[PDB]
Amino acid sequence: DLGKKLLEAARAGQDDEVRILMANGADVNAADDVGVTPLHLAAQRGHLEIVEVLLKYGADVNAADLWGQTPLHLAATAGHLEIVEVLLKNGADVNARDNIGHTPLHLAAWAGHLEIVEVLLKYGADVNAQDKFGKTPFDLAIDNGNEDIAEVLQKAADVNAYDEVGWTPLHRAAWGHLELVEKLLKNGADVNAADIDGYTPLHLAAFSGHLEIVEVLLKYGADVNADDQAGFTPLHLAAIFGHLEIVEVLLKNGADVNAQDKFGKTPFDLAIDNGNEDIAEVLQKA
Amino acid sequence: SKGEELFTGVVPILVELDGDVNGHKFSVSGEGEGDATYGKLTLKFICTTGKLPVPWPTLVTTLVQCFSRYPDHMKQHDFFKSAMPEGYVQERTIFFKDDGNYKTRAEVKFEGDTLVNRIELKGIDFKEDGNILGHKLEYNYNSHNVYIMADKQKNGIKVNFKIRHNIEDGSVQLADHYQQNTPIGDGPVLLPDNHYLSTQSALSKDPNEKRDHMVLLEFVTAAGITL
């Protein structure tokens, strides 16, 4: 019964019971159904005194639960700075991998914990480490809007780079970052890069409803009838989501009114089914 | 709505799936934790009826997008949490290329302090030596982009995305997901603008679990709206 009580004491934060249960025959390295030990719970739930007590009692600082997470992974994510420092002070593997391949640095960068990032870097975190989907802590910071962390990670040290889903910087910029799109295209970004699902930046822009970005993409040579493995064309998407001005521009730049998605619908049909009565109307003059 | 406030911390999860693919009836139960603040899921699933007739990868999607990391600048676009605690219905039709399709109806809601995903799955037109019933899908998973849209006329949301299961011999088995979520309760919900979720997953095996199981670690986050 000690293991369960020790896990529950470390979870609740009751440093009272931890030293009582350890004064009895409680195993400091007790593990539950899932591999969670008293040190995981103390680390994740911000219980610093219990972390120091457990580590002093010989807790395995690098114990890994079923998902490969260590107390450092949980502390870096939960944003518990002192616990991270203590764990690192007591031999925590700064570059331990969870099942996705995240390092503590990935998690801190994912979770928006700058002071954790700084600490992990200082204790030897590999800034170039990639999870099993190719993302570095920088990329994770980027995709989550953690600018300062991305700025710190980049400083810690290809416009056509593409991740494991085929998204280039232009795909990410297409979601309402006009100036970024202009810069990337100016620097030689492939305006017709098709992601893993066959979507081009013009697809995403039409789906997102960013007129300015669509226009810029088109005046830079974007295939207005792109459809490799996508199943739609930008004109289909713009017709689904009632973006009249998008439809006007796509047509003006040569959009095919007769193009059929993989379900056999034309942009007119999609506009009819979605109640976009205006788009259907001007699509009727073909 | 204030339903997002039910996810500020770690939430226990309970998954219950009664499946039926070409008359091969089976049941799955999963449990673990979800942490919306960081879009993290830590779950383990078990086939409570013995050998699972289909590969575990095919059920990952069917087996709680309310635990997706919606950053503060996208709070307005979190329909999933907005339908809580009464929850939402989640219906899907998963078409596998050159094979059969799944059809799922899930009721994702709170039962006490536990977010429960109770599912009913039906698969049809599957080939006994296909990638599914023949067990040719590798026991891994890929990163995917999940595109979310408000309903065709303003009651819930619609979601589409193409899953890509790896095959032992190199090729890939696609799976078109045509998802459709609708709130159960009558209270207010957040109808979002067009955006996407970026998903990560890691399938593994508990070496002490002799049953047919799937240890799942999953990271998800919304994106596509800023300023």
Numbering used by the authors:
A (entry chain A): 13 to 169, 177 to 305
B (entry chain B): 2 to 64, 68 to 231
What is the paper's account of this structure, in its own sentences?
To connect 3G124nc and either YKKD or YRLK we chose flexible GS-linkers. Therefore, two linkers of 7 and 11 aa named GS7 (GGGSGGG) and GS11 (GGGSGGGSGGG) were tested for linking 3G124nc with either YKKD or YRLK. The resulting four constructs were named gc_K7, gc_K11, gc_R7 and gc_R11 according to whether they contained YKKD or YRLK and the linker used was 7 or 11 aa long. Additionally, a variant of gc_R7 devoid of lysines (nl_gc_R7; no lysine gc_R7) was designed. All lysines, none of which were located at variable positions of the DARPin scaffold in gc_R7, were mutated to arginine, methionine or histidine. The complexes crystallized under various conditions with different unit cells and one to four complexes per asymmetric unit (AU). All GFP-clamps form 1:1 complexes with eGFP, in which the clamp indeed wraps around approximately half the eGFP molecule and creates a continuous large interaction surface, similar to the superposition of the two parental DARPins on GFP (Fig. 4(a,b and c)). The buried surface area (BSA) of the GFP-clamp complexes is 1625 ± 72 Å2. Hydrogen bonds of Trp79 from the GFP-clamp to Leu44 of eGFP, Trp79 to Leu220, Gln81 to Lys41, His114 to Gln204, Asp143 to Gln204, Asn156 to Arg73 and Phe226/230 (numbering for constructs with different linker lengths, respectively) to Asn198 seem to be the most crucial ones, since they are found in almost all complex structures. Coupling of up to three Alexa Fluor 647 molecules per GFP-clamp via maleimide chemistry was straightforward and very efficient, resulting in the triple-labelled construct 3 × AF647_gc_R7.
